[PDB]
Amino acid sequence: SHMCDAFVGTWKLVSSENFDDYMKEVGVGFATRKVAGMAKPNMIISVNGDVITIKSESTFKNTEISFILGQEFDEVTADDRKVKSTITLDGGVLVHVQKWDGKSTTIKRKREDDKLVVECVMKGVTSTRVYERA
Ligand SMILES: Cc1nc2ccc(Cl)cc2c(Cc2ccccc2Cl)c1C(=O)O
């Protein structure tokens, strides 16, 4: 479909702002925040037909999700939440909403110049994480 072509590839985390505070707001505990916050994950995005796969590999945890846009799925997050997720494309932005225990967080992924920018929002707290091609 050429849906998501500009996201496909292997990406490495190069900068982060406010991520500890985002994780606090989400409810992540101290030790997980410390170790997860040190990580420099490799995110690998691929598409096969209508199925998008996002893998993250790091010293902390490796995660993998596969999904169809607009179609809710189960995800266990790197901090071990069991959430129900829905990912859509809105105006060229991948919008990932996670629901658990009456709570919600949204992660937006966008191409900007040669970067892939990840914005994580929990209530009034936003974190911005920048990935570059690996
Ligand atoms: C959006 C996002 N949300 C996260 C939420 C919780 C945790 Cl512990 C790590 C997260 C990470 C980092 C991460 C993701 C997967 C595996 C290891 C790590 Cl440290 C990211 C991210 O930068 O993709």
Curated annotation (Swiss-Prot):
GO biological process: brown fat cell differentiation; cellular response to lithium ion; cellular response to tumor necrosis factor; cholesterol homeostasis; fatty acid transport; long-chain fatty acid transport; negative regulation of DNA-templated transcription; positive regulation of cold-induced thermogenesis
Subcellular compartments: Cytoplasm; Nucleus
Modification N-acetylcysteine occurs at: 4
CDD domains per the UniProt record, alphabetical: FABP4
UniProt keyword annotations, A-Z: Acetylation, Cytoplasm, Lipid-binding, Nucleus, Phosphoprotein, Transport
InterPro entries according to UniProt: Calycin, Fatty_acid-bd, ILBP, Lipocln_cytosolic_FA-bd_dom
Keyword Cytoplasm: yes
Gene Ontology terms: cellular component: cytoplasm; cytosol; extracellular exosome; lipid droplet; nucleus
Cited Gene3D superfamilies: 2.40.128.20
Transmembrane spans: none
Residues engaged in binding a fatty acid: 129-131
Modified residues (Phosphotyrosine): 22
Family stated for the protein in its record: Belongs to the calycin superfamily. Fatty-acid binding protein (FABP) family.
Protein task: Lipid transport protein in adipocytes. Binds both long chain fatty acids and retinoic acid. Delivers long-chain fatty acids and retinoic acid to their cognate receptors in the nucleus.
Domain commentary: Forms a beta-barrel structure that accommodates hydrophobic ligands in its interior.
PANTHER family named among the record's database cross-references: FATTY ACID BINDING PROTEIN
Quaternary organization: Monomer. Homodimer. Interacts with PPARG.
Name this protein carries in UniProt: Fatty acid-binding protein, adipocyte
Classification of source organism: Eukaryota, Metazoa, Chordata, Craniata, Vertebrata
